[PDB]
């Protein structure tokens, strides 16, 4: 019938203090690298990484990332890297830094090492970058012929990152099963190119189980800045499971709603990718046939993690029907992922956004 | 504490007649390839593949594989490939052909495409080759810095392969959960280098569930030479799930016993890799604490698939204690995988081999 | 209300080849021992033990046990031991040898080591010996102020002992929960002197679970003369769990029926202690309120282990009501254990013996 | 494979007013004893015991225990006992008195009777004493060739002991299953010398079940100073089950953390052994993979029993990372019990101590 496709980064390594073994993971690969990080991350981990590379006689061009994943920034860094004759690109930071590093590596056909300093999105493992305008407006997607070569996740670094970034990552990862399940049921396609494999289904379903079981303990672990088995499990769920699950499992309405928000200008854009996805996930559940108890199971967890569940929480308090319809039209554009699992109109989606807000308010009033 | 590592082939594609899209999956990669297959496989799929490559203006050096994964054969093919300026290596066939192709690709730093023509072992996705002497005697392992770039699995080709080869593949895949579970419980390491990830555990456990649910239907599908959803599920379990699960999930006693058989000369070596692993799996279960019902659940399935469950079935009828001890000493050598999950002596293992044979005989007498 | 009492041997050690560490377990204790075994056991383990003691500079008076646990034999060995100035008594063999060794140790106030060479009864751990006449007729009980100091159980030796002796031991151990449960429910006393403790209840109940789960696998292990985890579990159940469970958990009708058989002369006395107890256990179940399915669960296991379940199997085929009443009167004598859990007459018990035979016959006819 | 070892006191007797039968339990043993108790316990039970011994014509040297289990105190009492020609040592009181009595009995090779007047720790049944400096600083362990000969537990005396001492005993006993389960799973050793037996596993698991079922009722019973079936069950769990379970079942992280506190000076040392173990148990659970609900099940019970669950409760409010690391380094010293079940570093343990405190705080904020 249809072909099933699964893709994956070549190697994923996760553990406490693994950043100190970076020189060991590159011995056979090369001795000239470029390290990309923003100003904050240079202090948190960038210098530590350079030090470890120096101790291994690996050279490192130090690049200060502008802060936005834009074409101009990519061009700029690639030039610096070409000049430096870098064979390895090391991206260090959050989603925008990592997406930029992948683009730079593609331009150079270099080995790419992805070092997330927060478990805030499932960008790390994927074969795509989300490109923005220099001003921070979404512009396009950049797909690659390969997923990253090495994803190196140090849980000590992540235990010290802001709790809000772990909660955002849990939100992005909770969308995984909800969206992949909808694609599996509808016979739709994934970003990998075919129908999901059983491997992706197993991974996506385990992602949700892991988050419900350990998510709150992991959040408390980060608040106390310590590494625990609960945190190790949730960092893997937020990174490897969520990453494989969305890319090879499928996207549907939750991420389409997240994209629809770009049709609006405003304070909503100060929210993180995960915070927007949390609301988008409730909207997808409102478009599905679930009982009140089922939906409340997710609302309860989002609230415990201080994640947004109402239009007021996402800075659209008392938004107008017309504003919501702009989001819905953008979320239902040709090519969006919602069509992989639903046959709905923009009006159906606008109704579901208001419904989700109403269901959350009803829960809160208890 | 410990680091968890997961590795994987870059892309896995599975479906009916996917062999006819080979030219499409290589467009961006190159136009000069080397195709490796044995005499039988050249007729079954090798010519079809070359034809599709020609239609896409991709050149193909045709190589007839000797039949054994040996150093000499690897050297020979690599020379042919260098001369032909091949940038892509396509291995077509069973485990020995695929393991040889990986070695050839490593020598050339070429893109490697693995096209299994039977779902007989979990060799396809792994970053290692098992090397033998020209005469067919195990010699060593060859590990690589990368898993294969593309694994292309055509279920139409596999539906027409001998039922014995599907049963062998199911046997190799049934060892996956039993061995990975034992490594997860003991805190041991995997071939990927660290402790298992939750991803590998989910994959390995789903592997077993898939086989118990669809294995017999898949076997009947192959007997009738047709492709069904049951066959598609079992081919994925035998290839992608079993492959990731053993490599990134862990090996333990079952495969160590399989290796121990090389200490013996005889007709046992005409059995397939999977047939030997089926018995090795029963031995591992006899070394664990399981009730009779648990063990019989596996014996029952092996019998339905015409797989060996007694010493007589593996051509060691009335073998002596001394012969069995040679197997056990080889299976417990320093460096073997049994030590990742058990603290046993050769004598303990020799007793477990006889116990497994006795348990199977007791089941058969019913 | 009532006091609960638990007693136990000081140390229980079980494992493969532990007999070779005997000198190590006695280093601090003494250097002059007496070793008691019958002619058969001297060849199986007695000489091995003496050799290990010699290598440790521990002297050993070698005694050939007559074969019956009688007062005369005890006197004889004690004299030999006194003369030899033995400070340690080592009993090696089956129940009669061990019961004799305990008596000899009591006479001398010596340290006592119990080394069972078959897991055939729960005599090893208990603070009592069953004394017979020189001719093999029950005579009395001999209780001690202490349980044995060291019980050393070598599973390699037991794996090579006759399968019939393991089946007998499983039969003796299956009586444990059935009898202790009846004492716990009736508020009766145990041989330890008080009401059972929760510890004894936990031990007795786990004894039965262990036997149903691993008993058949252990029996098959012995048939093949190998040590497996199943055998290790059942040897512990037959020795430590059954021993603590009966002594500190309570005896009831099953063992009273076993004792009642001494009222008869005949071929029944060639059966083992465990074989007689298996039938006695069915009689106790026939005196309780169980459904047919419950009773058949035990009958099924006894048959699989080749244990007797009918009057014909215990050599009383077509026994007369008068003969059975002699058994019942003896089983209900003042002081017997049946009174700890039942308020029944000899006639009630004679009816239950015929009922058990009828229930077993009904099962066999299926 | 490995040998399993189980050890136990020779006789355990528990019941209301059993102290009045002490003369009866010693009739065959001797007529000259030494009775050890501190000033408070002499009034609560010491005089009553002497009176009962006098009525039986058994002499009794009265010793007032200093209050600390130190070498000097042991020497002092042993001298007094030698002079008195005492053949029996009777220790009456809490853990320190009992540990001292065992040492004195060892010096004299005397029969030892242990009479706990509170069910506050599982010291009663064990073959070891914890020795301190005269000033109250841990010094070493003193292991014996035998467990105590007689443990006599009067529940009437314990029903009148401070509720805090019963809660402490429940805390010590709740660690039993958590620690033994971790040793059973890891294949580690117990204090008895080998791997756990099934008997110890059954005992340890029943210990936890007993405490969850009857612990609160037993605590309320003591508050009202009455003996109830619930109290009888919990006193057995705190003494016999917890005692056998830890010694023959295994120790792991909970008790290692308890020992680590000796690296600190301060008010924490006024807490009881059980109060410290309660926190140590939460730390072990934080090092394991449990869901939030699982961990909260224990926190809820500790709070009901007024046991400490946070660093503030154990007098380390706002302790520094450096202070906690001293505890962790001491808890992970070579030879500590944590290594029997975990492969962790001091840093991993320091993180787990802060995590446990955070999880408890999160529960309390609800
Ligand atoms: N390609 C993909 O598959 C993909 C998937 C999901 C999300 N994304 C992309 O991810 C981006 C969002 O990424 P994000 O949420 O991580 O935000 P981000 O990358 O913009 O910002 C992360 C912020 O956290 C800070 N930070 C990182 N590590 C820190 C640490 N240890 N301590 C303190 N601060 C730290 C950074 O300095 C930065 O200000 C978007 O552009 C989105 O499109 C991409
Ligand atoms: N590197 C690894 O991880 C790994 C893992 C598992 C097994 N292995 C290796 O796999 C090898 C065993 O491989 P195998 O069991 O597939 O045997 P194989 O490769 O030796 O033989 C397969 C046989 O089946 C035939 N065949 C293949 N496709 C066919 C088709 N469609 N129709 C008819 N015949 C067909 C081939 O001509 C050949 O004779 C061993 O050398 C073992 O070490 C390697
Ligand atoms: N004191 C108690 O609590 C207690 C409890 C239960 C049973 N018992 C007593 O146990 C006795 C029955 O004991 P039993 O059933 O073991 O019989 P047993 O001691 O009379 O005989 C065992 C037989 O097995 C043989 N044997 C032992 N180990 C062997 C080995 N490794 N290989 C081959 N043969 C071996 C011995 O030579 C002997 O002939 C009775 O007298 C009964 O009263 C006592
Ligand atoms: N050897 C072991 O296995 C082992 C195991 C666990 C704990 N321990 C040891 O136990 C000791 C702690 O013992 P503990 O918690 O019982 O404290 P403890 O012995 O120091 O004190 C108990 C306190 O309670 C009082 N007390 C006892 N019975 C009483 C009663 N009926 N009414 C009023 N007060 C009464 C005593 O006078 C004393 O002040 C430690 O030294 C620890 O190392 C030893
Ligand atoms: Zn996302
Ligand atoms: Zn703003
Ligand atoms: Zn295999
Ligand atoms: Zn041959
Ligand atoms: Zn018996
Ligand atoms: Zn006869
Ligand atoms: Zn304790
Ligand atoms: Zn103080």
Curated annotation (Swiss-Prot), chains A, B, C, D:
A Pfam family that the UniProt record links to this protein: Fe-ADH
GO terms assigned for molecular function: glycerol dehydrogenase (NAD+) activity; metal ion binding
Keywords carried by this UniProt record: Glycerol metabolism, Metal-binding, NAD, Oxidoreductase, Zinc
Pathway: Polyol metabolism; glycerol fermentation; glycerone phosphate from glycerol (oxidative route): step 1/2
Cellular component terms (Gene Ontology): cytosol
Enzyme class: oxidoreductase
Chain positions recorded as glycerol binding sites: 122, 172, 255
Entries under PROSITE patterns matching the protein: ADH_IRON_1 (PS00913), ADH_IRON_2 (PS00060)
Presence of the UniProt keyword NAD in the record: yes
Activity profile over pH: Optimum pH is 6.0-8.5.
Bound cofactor: record note: Binds 1 zinc ion per subunit.
Residues reported to bind Zn(2+): 172, 255, 273
Coiled coil: none
Assembly and binders: Homooctamer.
Domain writeup: Consists of two domains that are separated by a deep cleft, in which the Zn(2+) ion is bound.
Family: Belongs to the iron-containing alcohol dehydrogenase family.
Protein name: Glycerol dehydrogenase
Organism listed in the record: Geobacillus stearothermophilus
Lineage: Bacteria, Bacillati, Bacillota, Bacilli, Bacillales
Gene for this chain: gldA
């Amino acid at each position: 019938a249809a072909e099933r496709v699964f893709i994956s980064p070549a190697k994923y390594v996760q553990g406490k203090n693994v950043i100190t073994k970076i020189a060991n993971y590159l011995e056979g690969i090369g001795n000239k690298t470029v390290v990309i990080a923003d100003e904050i991350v240079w202090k948190i981990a960038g210098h530590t990484i350079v030090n470890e590379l120096k101790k291994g006689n690996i050279a490192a061009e130090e690049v200060v990332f502008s802060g936005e994943a834009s074409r101009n920034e990519v061009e700029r860094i690639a030039n610096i890297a070409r000049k430096a004759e870098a064979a390895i690109v090391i991206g260090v930071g959050g989603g925008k830094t990592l997406d930029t590093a992948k683009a730079v590596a593609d331009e150079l056909d270099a080995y790419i090492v992805i070092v997330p300093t927060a478990a805030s999105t499932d960008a790390p493992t994927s074969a795509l970058s989300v490109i923005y305008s220099d001003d921070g407006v979404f512009e396009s997607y950049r797909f690659y012929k390969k997923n990253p070569d090495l994803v190196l996740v140090d849980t000590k670094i992540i235990a010290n990152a802001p709790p809000r970034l772990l909660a955002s990552g849990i939100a992005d990862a909770l969308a995984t099963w909800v969206e992949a399940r909808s694609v599996i049921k509808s016979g739709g396609k994934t970003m990998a190119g075919g129908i999901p494999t059983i491997a992706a289904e197993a991974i996506a379903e385990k992602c949700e189980q892991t988050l419900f079981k350990y998510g709150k303990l992991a959040y408390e672990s980060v608040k106390a800045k310590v590494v625990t088995p609960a945190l190790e499990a949730v960092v893997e769920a937020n990174t490897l499971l969520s990453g494989l699950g969305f890319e090879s499992g499928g996207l549907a309405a939750a991420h389409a709603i997240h994209n629809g928000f770009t049709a609006l200008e405003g304070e909503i854009h100060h929210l993180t990718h995960g915070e927007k996805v949390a609301f988008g996930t409730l909207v997808q559940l409102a478009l599905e046939e679930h009982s009140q108890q089922e939906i409340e199971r997710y609302i309860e967890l989002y609230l415990c993690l201080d994640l947004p569940v109402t239009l007021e929480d996402i800075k659209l308090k008392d938004a107008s029907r017309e504003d919501i319809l702009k989001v819905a039209k953008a979320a239902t554009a040709e090519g969006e992922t919602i069509h992989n699992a639903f046959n709905v109109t923009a009006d159906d989606v606008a109704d579901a956004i208001f419904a989700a807000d109403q269901y959350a308010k009803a829960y809160k009033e208890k």
